[PDB]
Amino acid sequence: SLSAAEADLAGKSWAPVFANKNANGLDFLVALFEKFPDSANFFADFKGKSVADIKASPKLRDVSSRIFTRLNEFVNNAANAGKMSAMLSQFAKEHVGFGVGSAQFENVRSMFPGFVASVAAPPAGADAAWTKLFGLIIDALKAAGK
Numbered sequence: 001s002l003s004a005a006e007a008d009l010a011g012k013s014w015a016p017v018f019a020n021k022n023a024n025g026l027d028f029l030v031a032l033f034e035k036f037p038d039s040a041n042f043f044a045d046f047k048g049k050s051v052a053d054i055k056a057s058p059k060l061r062d063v064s065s066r067i068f069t070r071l072n073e074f075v076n077n078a079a080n081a082g083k084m085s086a087m088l089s090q091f092a093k094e095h096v097g098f099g100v101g102s103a104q105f106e107n108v109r110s111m112f113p114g115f116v117a118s119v120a121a122p123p124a125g126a127d128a129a130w131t132k133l134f135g136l137i138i139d140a141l142k143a144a145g146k
């Protein structure tokens with residue numbers, strides 16, 4: 001888990017992004033698909049589609065919102081080893097069954113900070129807090145078989 005200070009930092013950096021959940025969620029998904037083209041292929045709804053098509057899809061909103069809702073939950077419990085364990089296990093188990101591995105999460109992690117910074121400059125120490133959270137997810141995926 002993160003420390004209370006670290007969770008705090010992550011939370012502070014997230015609030016501005018989450019404040020406009022609909023628009024920022026869509027944006028995050030889009031950026032991922034742009035930086036790492038292969039990711040769209042894991043999605044049922046998106047495999048084969050270009051970014052423009054994805055942008056135009058009525059399915060986009062459902063997908064990005066479920067992603068932000070969940071990430072929000074992670075940020076809000078990151079400092080509780082207790083909730084983290086349950087959250088991480090279940091997220092990792094779910095994702096491996098869809099065929100998603102740690103490598104996909106290494107990509108997310110590499111682009112996250114730049115994504116946040118696109119919304120508002122994060123506070124000092126936030127970037128390391130996220131890389132730390134993302135690191136916990138990665139380990140969970142490697143423990144789940146991928």
Ligand code: HEM
Pocket residue numbers: 039042043044045066067068070071095098100104105108
């Ligand atoms: C950024 C961190 C991510 C979060 C918080 C997250 C969250 C979720 C959640 C909550 C759902 C299930 C929603 C529901 O059915 O109610 C989901 C499903 C899924 N996610 Fe993720 N996801 C993340 C990253 C990704 C990435 C990187 C991939 C692909 C590379 C992805 C691939 C999948 C797939 C294919 C499903 C199956 C659901 C569907 O396609 O309909 N996830 N994820």
